Structures are given as structure tokens and as C-alpha cells.
Amino acid sequence: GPQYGIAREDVVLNRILGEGFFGEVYEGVYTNHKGEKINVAVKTCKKDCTLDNKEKFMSEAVIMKNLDHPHIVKLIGIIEEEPTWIIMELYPYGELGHYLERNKNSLKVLTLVLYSLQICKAMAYLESINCVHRDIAVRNILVASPECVKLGDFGLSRYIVTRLPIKWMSPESINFRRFTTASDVWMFAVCMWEILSFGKQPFFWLENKDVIGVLEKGDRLPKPDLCPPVLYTLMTRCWDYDPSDRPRFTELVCSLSDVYQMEKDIAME
């Protein structure tokens, strides 16, 4: 049978991209069999790491390899042999938050609803296998093309004050470190708020320590200027203090699809 894995020689490291949880991340170029140049991010794991952290590094690779969803970031390959490389597709358009900020003056509300729906579909898939993501935010969404966004890597806290994203988190996550598909629904609605606000930071007017007090009073993020009122109602249902009262992602996909079709039609007239 033909060689399955990526050969290490087909991946050239060009520069440091940054420091990740398990080790350094490099920018590189992967050359496929057709000779095409594919820009990649190469995640590495420190050789000195505990075999537990080495296992978890591989576990995340295995999940990303198998998800294979149009709205989740693509894994290109795994080179298991040390030094272990996780080869991810690199997206030149970059993060969604910055993309929205630079394109604010040309972006239509239709497109913001589309991105929300695309991420919602990714989340419905994760919900179907009870897989909790914990980092659904515009800084962790990549723009594959103007037509397609992709949810990024799982939240680091699964691995396991840690600089938690307090301003995006459900009250049960903040208060009791509970992370469930329902706390993902809360976070997703914060992500929608970011999208429909062209990348504003949620609760930008508060310090992290102020956030839970505000939520307990029943205060919530305000309606973004260009947010369709129907979508704000959807967000408010996602921000129910009671996780059991929040919509499931399956329900949200139906709701968002309806809104998308409605906005497309309203737009013509």
C-alpha cells in the first residue's frame, strides 16, 4: 500500500508563528504530490513534556484530524515520529475579528448572519458527540474565504486565574468551572454578538472581575446596532442563567437558517 502520512521532507519550516500550549508553532509550506504549495502552521510538542501532555497533544490532533467539517479548521497531517509535527492549514485572511474590523464599511448584515450560521453548524456537529469546545470567539475563528469561516482549536483549559476568557463565559463556567454543550451555547451567542458588532470585545467597558456581578443582576450585552432584532432575541435565550433553558445548537441552526433566508429575501426588496 502507498505511504499514508505526510513525509517530513514535504514540509519546510520558514519562521516562528508563536508559542502554543504544548510548544512552539512554526509557519511552513507543505508540498503535496501534485506539487502544489500549501501554507501550513506546524504545531510541536516539547520533547521534555510529561508523557501526559504528550498524550493530550496527540489527542487534540486526533480530534482535529477526524472532525473533517467545512466550518472547523483543517488538519493536513500528523508526523508522529519525534519531533512530532501537527500540520494545520494556514488561512491567509486570518482571524475573523480582525477581518470584520477592516471590512466593516463594506460588509452586509447577510454575511454576518451567514458566518454565525456556519459556526453554528460546526457546533451542532460537536454537540451531537457531546464534545465541548470552550473557545467560540472571533479571535478563534479563521477566514478561509469571504464565503467560509472555520472554528479554531479547542479551548486550552481541557488539557487541563489561567487568563480565562471571563467576558465570553457562562455563569456556571465562571462560578463552578462547569463546561457543557449548554455553556458552549452561551459562548456561541457571545461570538454572535462579536460578529454582529464587527469584532467588538464583549463587556469592553468592564474589568473581568465586574462581569459575574453584572450577569447576576440580569444585565446582558446590548443589541448591536445592525443586529436583526430576531437574532438579539436568540442571543438573549442563549444567555439564560439556567443552562437547561438555553436552546440546543440543533435548534439554533434551524433558527439561524430561517433568519438567513429571511434576510436574503428582505434584501431584494
Q: Which residues are annotated as a binding site for ATP?
A: 17-25, 43, 89-95
Question: Which CB sits closer to Mg ion, 52 or 245?
Answer: 245
Residues 25-84, interacting with Mg ion (CB under 5 A)? none
Count how many residues are written for the chain. 269
Out of 10, 135, 219, 242, the active site residue is 135
Is 135 one of the annotated active-site residues of the chain? yes
- Burial of residue 248 (CB within 10 Å: 0-12, 13-18, 19+) is middle
Q: Which stretch binds Mg ion (CB under 5 A): 8-16, 26-34, 80-88, 243-251?
A: 243-251
CA distance 167 to 171: 10
CA distance 59 to 211: 33
x/- letters, 186..225, toward Mg ion (CB under 5 A):
----------------------------------------
Residue 218 C-beta: closest distance to Mg ion, Å: 12
Other C-beta atoms within 10 Å of 213: how many? 10
Distance of CA 24 to the CA centre of its chain: 20
CA distance 45 to 104: 38
Q: Which stretch binds Mg ion (CB under 5 A): 43-51, 145-153, 227-235, 240-248?
A: 240-248
Please give the size of the binding site for Mg ion, defined by CB under 5 A. Answer: 2
245: contact with Mg ion by CB under 5 A: yes
Question: Which CB sits closer to Mg ion, 219 or 245?
Answer: 245
Question: Which CB sits closer to Mg ion, 216 or 245?
Answer: 245
Q: Which residues neighbour 135 within 8 Å (Cβ) at sequence distance 6 or greater?
A: 152, 153, 154, 155, 156, 165, 187
Question: Which CB sits closer to Mg ion, 203 or 239?
Answer: 239
Q: Which stretch binds Mg ion (CB under 5 A): 41-49, 187-195, 227-235, 236-244?
A: 236-244
Number of H-type helices and E-type strands within the chain: 8, 7
Q: Give residue for cell 482571524.
A: 95
Are 26 and 86 in contact, with CB atoms under 8 Å apart?
no
Which one of residues 9, 207, 225, 242 is an interface residue with Mg ion (CB under 5 A)? Answer: 242
Instruction: Indicate which residues carry an active-site annotation.
Output: 135
Residues near Mg ion, by CB under 5 A: 242, 245
